[PDB]
């Protein structure tokens, strides 16, 4: 009942930029393996055992925020599902450790080999300690979205980071088949070691809160090009089949002539003497048709993309020349340019644009082509291994190739144009590379709520860094975490990356920044204005006022504010210190303004909008959703109720809705080895739990899912199902083979509530309700499923010690929707006993105030933490590779839920 | 009953026999993982004879079976544990105990 | 002084609105053709806002405040009851030789510290 208090030591995880993945067409390979070497750690430097894991994690959900969170503190690998790492004496999976029997076994110390070998092809992560196996491997855990490797750590180690090749020796030979890990390094960065996503970071003159960082995704390793078959190839090309086609044999070749690669009558092409400018007649039949059908296989693409030709001017076959240039004069049967000669001939910017889509439509067939040969990506080239360093997307790609690609087909477009047939550019369709997740966008960051101003004049400069979407201004202090500034009346802000200032919606104001700008906001509540100042010059509406706002309210106060787009890097100064300021002194200190923490001896506490969800209950005044606490009868249990008001009618709120109860059931310490009415001797005695729903009419099935859930669940997927769910069995077994456990393990324990309908011809509208039913043995660790009161062929077996909390996910499509029965059949003990210890012996059903319905919000406010982590991250040497040390260390009093086990 | 499970092994040649004090660094946690006491918040190692039965029967007959230096781990089972009373208002009657042994010094 | 003279003269300001309706002045080019470059009804015959002296005054009188001392401040606001007590220059200046000692102390309020800091944290202050 009562919170619980500790000190818990802050925990940081770092990894390298190396992330894989599989996919259908992936150009990635499925096997990896990296290692980490231990310089020195202290076995308590706090009250609290030092923390230090290493393995693997998940680049979609994998979110480590410093401080408080998941059970009791100092999440790193293993705490969620997202992560798979290995302590030295556990597989850390789930918050749950698993011993692991291994040729001496002991927590990591100094000189100790952690050899992480993940196969992608089946799934499975294999760990090796000092060269001997870590008897036990990961399974049947969840493929979607990207690895990578990841440390741990609390304060206080040194750790090194062999990725083999340059970056490391391994120490020890790699599996075969298993490919070191600085091999999956893509061609435009550089290797480097970084956290993960985070809001904060190091900065020259003062902290820069960071906006999200964009994240690679495994969608973005398939080469996904325009189908070039199904294009009937019309008249006007076949008419030009021929000079773009006699413009390209030889184009690659016109370079090096008068070179090292000067051509020869003995030889031909790839002999060190390539060029060849005589004529593709001489050259090889069916290259040469193939290079004729491939110019129109770039026209086929310039069909599927929308280009078409037309005819105006004068033919450019009059006057257009050949040129026998002093150069490229050859002695094989006369000279002439290796393609055919052009004359002066321009480009517009559309076709530099369709140029270079249609040399990313280029590479990306050729890429599928590779990968259908079964080739793969790696940053050093080996042929035999059937390996290259260039199989990656255009949009991948490094600047050299793309230049390289785009040269050829931008002459080629070049001698098309110079015939004047039109290149006329498609219509424009604008389109958004991702869309579900839009609260990872948006971050917001605003002073605590105790330092919010009533009175006064207030100026904080906000220097943006970068030049992206960063709204900066002043918000009442019950501001939303997951709104956009502006969107309401709670936020005065100024949007900078188009220049407007938002408030119920937009309006234009002021010009928009640039780069290094800092952003100065003014508040005046005495005549109850706001202004903003960019690099020391006042900002102007579309009048010759210089107010931002005007009529302002007092109100509950203000707090200033601001928020970055993914990808963006500002500095709020507040002003702490005077002499800091840069452009205070030009505007503000003559005109009566205050920095808004001038005599603040700690620095003004941050609360930034956490991207996490989590379960919080819902308040009676939600406009869509409404929860109904009916009494019970006497023949029926008190139900909670589910109701849409405003579904039927317009601007109605339709989204795939996160429901849980308020109240987690744990699993036994131990378990046990190896008419109607219920009887006393078994209804005493029993340890079995049931709850029933009942999916009204008019509401499908088919978007239903009913279970339990850990308390760990922060699943928001839009587009839901029992596909997305997280789940990870451990195998665990002796040196050779003879796996003694292989334990399944999941967050989220659903049944699709489809599978439990007659598929009728027609009649979806079913006007029995669905009453699935759910029983739980906690003394087994089993639990069923009943469609209709008749179990069903699912079930489910968790460890013991297990929270797991009443879940139903809908996606709402009626008036009536659900209606959770917390009741109780013929000898079997209702949750009135499962939640509250208690009414142990009571089986009379009850819903007592404290069970409440909760959803899921996906955004929730959080506190910085007023220091972090010194975490230095750097290059040792050539052979040692990059190396981790942190030294200073740094608790935090966490206070802890007990029953969502979440402090 | 008492069985151990090593962390951080020891030297494995001295062992605690009968007649001295065990000076350890306990950190006992119950069955749930809610960590119920420590030694090192306080800072001072928990010295206790051997033998007379000073400190509970789980833990003491834990004590002898790992060395010097040795990080270790003990399931009190509610047998060689406190059991039926429990600790009055700190520990639940029958309840396992689970506890980070570290037997740092002999004296 | 001009814009002493300014208000202290209503014809001056009469004549002004003359000015400005037979030369059409529109005061909002006159101000916002620099916004114009930096690409970014009601009284537009004439008001007091769109007064260009008063535009004048206002875009600089911040460096007549800069060039006072934040210990003057009372001094300030003692001299707005004066000139609300109409008085004149010449009055002016002996109350204020009175007032001498009246001048504000840095100790009495905590912003007149970090004032004082950035005062004299200008390279280009001398205390004589």
């Given at each position: ?8 030591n802050?925990?940081?995880?770092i990894?390298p ?7 259908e067409?992936?150009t990635?390979?499925g ?19 030092t923390?230090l894991?290493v ?8 979110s480590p ?5 998941e ?31 291994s040729?001496?076994q ?11 070998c ?33 440390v741990?750590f ?16 391994f120490?020890?030979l ?9 091999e999956?390094?893509?061609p ?11 809001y ?14 964009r994240?690679?995704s495994?969608?973005?390793?398939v ?7 199904q294009?009937?190839?019309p008249?006007?090309?076949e008419?030009?089949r021929?000079?773009?086609?006699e413009?390209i044999?030889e ?11 000067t ?32 110019s129109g296989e770039?026209?086929?693409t310039?069909?599927?993309?929308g ?28 000279y ?5 000669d ?9 076709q ?8 990313e ?46 040269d050829?087909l ?11 047939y ?11 590379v ?12 605003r002073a ?6 009533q ?7 906000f ?14 202090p ?10 309401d ?11 407007q200032?938002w ?11 640039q780069?290094?700008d ?18 020391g ?27 970055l ?6 500095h ?20 009566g303004?205050?920095p808004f923490?001038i005599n ?28 109904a606490?009916?009494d ?16 039927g ?24 080895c ?60 002796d ?67 297990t ?9 709402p499509?009626?008036?009536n929707?659900?209606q ?10 209702p ?22 319905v909760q ?10 933490p007023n ?17 981790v ?19 | ?12 040649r ?10 350890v ?17 306080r ?6 004879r051997i ?5 509970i ?5 834990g004590?002898?079976?790992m ?18 009373t ?22 | 002084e001009?814009?002493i003279y ?44 769109t ?11 911040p460096?007549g ?16 009851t ?25 100790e ?21």
């Amino acid at each position: 009942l009562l919170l619980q208090t500790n000190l818990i030591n802050y925990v940081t995880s770092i990894r390298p930029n190396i992330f894989v993945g599989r996919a259908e067409g992936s150009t990635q390979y499925g096997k990896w393996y990296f290692e980490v070497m231990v310089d020195e750690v202290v076995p308590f430097l706090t009250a609290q055992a030092t923390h230090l894991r290493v393995g693997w994690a998940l680049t979609e959900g994998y979110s480590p925020y410093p401080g408080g969170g998941e059970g009791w503190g100092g999440n790193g690998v293993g705490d969620d599902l997202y992560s798979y790492g290995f302590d030295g004496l556990h597989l850390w999976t789930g918050h749950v450790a698993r011993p692991v029997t291994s040729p001496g076994q002991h927590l990591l110390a100094p000189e100790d080999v952690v050899s992480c070998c993940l196969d992608l092809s089946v799934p499975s992560i294999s760990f090796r300690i000092n060269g001997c196996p870590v008897q036990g491997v990961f399974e049947a855990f969840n493929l979607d979205g990207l690895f990578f490797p990841v440390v741990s750590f609390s304060a206080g180690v040194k750790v090194r980071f062999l990725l083999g090749g340059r970056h490391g020796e391994f120490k020890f030979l790699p599996p075969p088949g298993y490919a070191p890990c600085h091999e999956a390094v893509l061609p435009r960065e550089r290797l480097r070691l970084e956290p993960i996503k985070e809001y904060r970071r190091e900065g020259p003159r003062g902290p820069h809160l960071v906006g999200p960082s964009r994240c690679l995704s495994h969608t973005d390793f398939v080469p996904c090009p325009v189908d070039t078959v199904q294009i009937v190839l019309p008249p006007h090309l076949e008419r030009i089949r021929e000079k773009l086609a006699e413009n390209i044999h030889e184009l690659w070749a016109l370079t090096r002539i008068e070179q090292g690669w000067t051509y020869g009558p003995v030889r031909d092409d790839n002999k060190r003497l390539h060029p060849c400018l005589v004529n593709f007649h001489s050259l090889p039949e069916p290259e040469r048709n193939y290079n004729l059908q491939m110019s129109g296989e770039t026209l086929k693409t310039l069909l599927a993309l929308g280009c078409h030709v037309g005819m105006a001017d004068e033919k450019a076959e009059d006057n257009l020349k050949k040129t026998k240039l002093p150069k490229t004069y050859m002695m094989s049967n006369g000279y002439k340019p290796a393609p055919l000669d052009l004359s002066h001939v321009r480009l517009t910017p559309a076709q530099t644009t369709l140029v270079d889509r249609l040399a990313e439509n280029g590479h990306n067939v050729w890429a599928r082509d590779r990968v259908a040969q079964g080739w793969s990506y790696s940053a050093v080239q080996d042929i035999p291994a059937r390996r290259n360093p260039r199989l990656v997307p255009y949009r991948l790609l490094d600047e050299a190739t793309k230049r390289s690609n785009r040269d050829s087909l931008c002459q080629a477009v070049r001698t098309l144009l110079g015939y004047g047939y039109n290149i006329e550019p498609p219509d424009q369709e604008p389109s958004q590379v991702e869309n579900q997740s839009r609260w990872d966008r948006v971050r917001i960051f605003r002073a605590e709520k105790s330092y919010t101003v009533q009175s006064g004049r207030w100026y904080f400069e906000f220097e943006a860094v970068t030049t992206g979407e960063m709204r900066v201004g002043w918000a009442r202090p019950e501001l939303r975490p997951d709104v956009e500034l502006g969107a309401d009346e709670l936020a005065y802000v100024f949007n900078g990356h188009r220049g407007q200032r938002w408030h119920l919606g937009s309006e234009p104001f002021g010009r928009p920044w640039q780069s290094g700008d800092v952003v100065g906001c003014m508040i005046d509540l005495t005549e109850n204005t706001i202004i903003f100042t960019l690099n020391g010059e006042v900002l102007m509406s579309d009048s010759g006022s210089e107010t931002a706002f005007r009529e302002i309210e007092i109100g509950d106060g203000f707090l200033p504010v601001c928020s970055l787009g993914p990808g963006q890097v500002g500095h709020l100064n507040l002003g702490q210190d005077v002499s800091s300021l840069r452009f205070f002194a030009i505007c503000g200190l003559q005109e009566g303004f205050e920095p808004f923490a001038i005599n603040m001896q700690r620095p003004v506490t941050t609360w930034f909008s956490k991207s996490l969800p989590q379960f919080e209950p819902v308040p009676p005044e939600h406009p869509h959703y409404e929860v109904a606490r009916m009494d019970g009868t006497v023949d029926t249990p008190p139900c909670l109720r589910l109701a849409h008001r405003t579904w039927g009618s317009q601007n109605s709120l339709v989204e795939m809705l996160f429901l849980r109860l308020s109240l987690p059931v744990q699993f036994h310490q131990h378990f046990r080895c190896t008419d109607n009415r219920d009887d006393p001797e078994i209804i005493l005695n029993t340890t079995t739990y049931y709850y029933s729903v009942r999916v009204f009419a008019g509401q499908e099935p088919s978007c239903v899912w009913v279970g339990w859930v850990t308390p760990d669940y922060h699943q928001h997927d839009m587009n839901f199902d029992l596909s997305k769910v997280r789940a990870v069995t451990v195998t665990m077994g002796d040196e050779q083979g003879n796996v003694h456990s292989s334990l399944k393990c999941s967050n989220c324990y659903m049944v699709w509530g489809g599978d439990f309908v007659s598929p009728g011809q027609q009649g979806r509208i079913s006007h029995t309700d669905l009453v699935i039913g759910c029983l739980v043995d906690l003394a087994t660790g089993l639990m069923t499923f009943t469609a209709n009161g008749k179990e069903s062929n699912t079930f489910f077996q968790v460890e013991p010690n297990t929270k797991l909390f009443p879940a139903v996910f809908v996606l709402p499509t009626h008036q009536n929707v659900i209606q959770f029965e917390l009741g109780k059949q013929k000898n079997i003990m209702p949750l009135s006993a499962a939640m509250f210890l208690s009414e142990r012996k009571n089986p009379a059903p009850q819903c007592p105030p404290r069970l409440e319905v909760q959803m899921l919000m996906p955004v929730s406010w959080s506190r910085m933490p007023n220091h972090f982590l010194q975490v230095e991250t750097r290059r040792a040497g050539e052979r040692l590779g990059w190396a981790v040390q942190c030294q200073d260390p740094l608790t935090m009093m966490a206070l802890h839920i007990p029953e969502e086990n979440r402090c | 009953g008492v069985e151990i499970e090593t962390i951080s092994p020891g030297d494995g040649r001295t062992f605690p026999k009968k007649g001295q004090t065990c000076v350890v660094h306990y950190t006992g946690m119950l069955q749930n993982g809610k960590k119920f006491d420590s030694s090192r918040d306080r800072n001072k190692p928990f010295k206790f004879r051997i033998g007379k039965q000073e400190v509970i029967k789980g833990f003491e007959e834990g004590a002898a079976q790992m060395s010097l230096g040795q990080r270790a781990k003990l399931t009190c089972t509610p047998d060689v544990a406190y059991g039926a009373t429990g600790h009055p208002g700190v520990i639940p009657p029958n309840a396992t105990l689970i506890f980070d042994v570290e037997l740092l010094n002999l004296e | 002084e001009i814009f002493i003279y300014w208000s202290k003269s209503h014809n001056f300001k009469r004549e002004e609105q003359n000015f400005v309706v037979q030369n059409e002045i529109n005061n909002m080019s006159f101000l916002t053709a620099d916004s114009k470059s930096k690409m970014a009804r009601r009284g537009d015959r004439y008001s007091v806002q769109t007064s260009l002296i008063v535009a004048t005054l206002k875009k600089m009188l911040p460096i007549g405040l800069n060039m006072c001392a934040p210990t003057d401040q009372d001094l300030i606001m003692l001299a707005k009851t004066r000139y609300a007590l109409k008085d004149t220059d010449e009055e002016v200046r002996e109350f204020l030789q009175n007032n001498l000692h009246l001048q504000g102390k840095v100790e009495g309020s905590p912003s007149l510290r970090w004032q004082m800091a950035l005062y004299r944290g200008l390279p280009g202050r001398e205390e004589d």
